[PDB]
């Protein structure tokens, strides 16, 4: 998190707001419910408290504008700048204006008025932009998800640096964004994508280019709004330029930024039984056209080329790769070496000598 210079703080807990005008794309009530939801976010974790006025002059003055709309800073038509806010202060201070060239909705369409407000209200309460991609106060918009909204920990920490906490936060457990260097870090799925390493953990993935040491951290819905937050497993078909992604019984094929025709499919179509309710980890071998799919203590070998499970499967992980425990969280392969992630550990399995070369902390893929 970041606060503003001089630590611009409201000195009163009971504040006021006023919705000057409204977006055509929404109903007055749908709009009032949003902003009210948006302050609730901040109020739930601070001594703060918000009261809507219906006339005159409030602390936070909320209006909708187009292009040049009053203040020296103009809006930019559709997309681009979504809104802006001023830090706590006397007049323009606390205000937030929203772009009216936008399709405001309370859904996954247009731009979510409640999401954009929650963010922009933060500025109004003294929070500057955060560098954490996990934070609400991150400079770039991303539709969080359909699921019920939780305020990220970075934000809770930042706002409480100013005011908080309050008496009863209705759900104390706020999502921390993963730590690349925590030696207890365990991974969800791993894949190559266009030469780079993709490492999934929660609602994020790291992308780590062979030539970099610090990976970048994306939110998964930043790339693929449609995919879930947590991923079970992932693998690539490189030559065919494509990445497969698993969660529960659904699985997606993706070419760069878009889902393929008629995905997701059920894993049953892959030949798996019905009692198998998730793929834990998966790796494709371009050499041979086959894909390993791990589930529980078992492993399937599917023929990615000819679309059929190999015969003699499933087999037990403990037979075909002994000594890596009986589960596989994530796996990828590189140049004859398979990397098997079991909790905070990673095993380097040599196909060549058919055994474990070395053993190392899972996060050492993240240059830790």
């Amino acid at each position: 998190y970041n606060v503003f210079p001089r630590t611009l703080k409201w000195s009163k807990m009971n504040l006021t707001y006023r919705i000057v005008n409204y977006t055509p794309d929404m109903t007055h009530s749908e709009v009032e419910k949003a902003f009210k939801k948006a302050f609730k976010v901040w109020s739930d974790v601070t001594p703060l408290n918000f009261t809507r006025l219906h006339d005159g002059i409030a602390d936070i003055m909320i209006s909708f504008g187009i292009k040049e709309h009053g203040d020296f800073y103009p809006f930019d038509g559709p997309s681009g700048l979504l809104a802006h806010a001023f830090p706590p202060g006397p007049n323009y201070g606390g205000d937030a204006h929203f772009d009216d060239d936008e399709t405001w909705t309370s859904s996954s369409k247009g731009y979510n008025l409640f999401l954009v407000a929650a963010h922009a209200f933060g500025h109004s309460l003294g929070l500057d932009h955060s560098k954490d991609p996990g934070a609400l106060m991150f400079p770039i918009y991303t539709y969080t998800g359909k699921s019920h909204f939780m305020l990220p920990d970075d934000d809770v920490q930042g706002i409480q640096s100013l005011y908080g906490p309050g008496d009863e936060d209705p759900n104390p457990k706020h999502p921390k964004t993963p730590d690349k260097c925590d030696p207890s870090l365990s991974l969800d799925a791993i894949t190559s994508l266009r030469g780079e390493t993709m490492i999934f953990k929660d609602r994020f993935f790291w992308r780590l280019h062979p030539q970099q040491v610090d990976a970048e951290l994306f939110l998964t819905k930043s790339f693929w709004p449609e995919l879930p937050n947590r991923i079970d497993a992932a693998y690539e078909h490189p030559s065919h330029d494509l990445i497969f992604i698993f969660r529960g019984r659904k699985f997606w094929a993706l070419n760069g930024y878009d889902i393929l025709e008629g995905y997701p499919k059920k894993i049953s179509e892959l030949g798996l039984p019905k009692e198998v309710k998730k793929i834990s980890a998966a790796v494709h071998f371009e050499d041979t056209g086959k894909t390993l799919l791990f589930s529980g203590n078992q492993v399937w070998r599917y023929d990615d080329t000819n679309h059929i499970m190999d015969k003699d499967y499933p087999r037990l992980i403990e037979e075909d790769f002994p000594g890596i425990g009986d589960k596989v969280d994530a796996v990828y392969e590189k140049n004859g070496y398979i990397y098997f992630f079991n909790g905070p550990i990673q095993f380097e399995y040599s196909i060549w000598s058919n055994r474990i070369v070395r053993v190392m902390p899972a996060n050492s893929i993240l240059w830790c």
């Binding site: 503003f4 210079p5 611009l8 800073y73 997309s79 681009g80 700048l81 979504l82 809104a83 802006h84 806010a85 001023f86 830090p87 202060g89 006397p90 323009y92 201070g93 731009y111 954009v116 963010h119 922009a120 500025h123 500057d128 932009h129 400079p139 770039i140 918009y141 070419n255 760069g256 930024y257 878009d258």
Partner: peptide
């Protein structure tokens, strides 16, 4: 004197931003 609001305005206004980037790229 002198008479002027030393904190007349704030440059510290900040905007949220969504890129105009586009789907269907192959």
């Amino acid at each position: 004197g002198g008479d002027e609001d030393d904190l007349s305005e704030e440059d510290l206004q900040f905007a949220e931003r969504y890129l105009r980037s586009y789907y269907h790229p192959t």
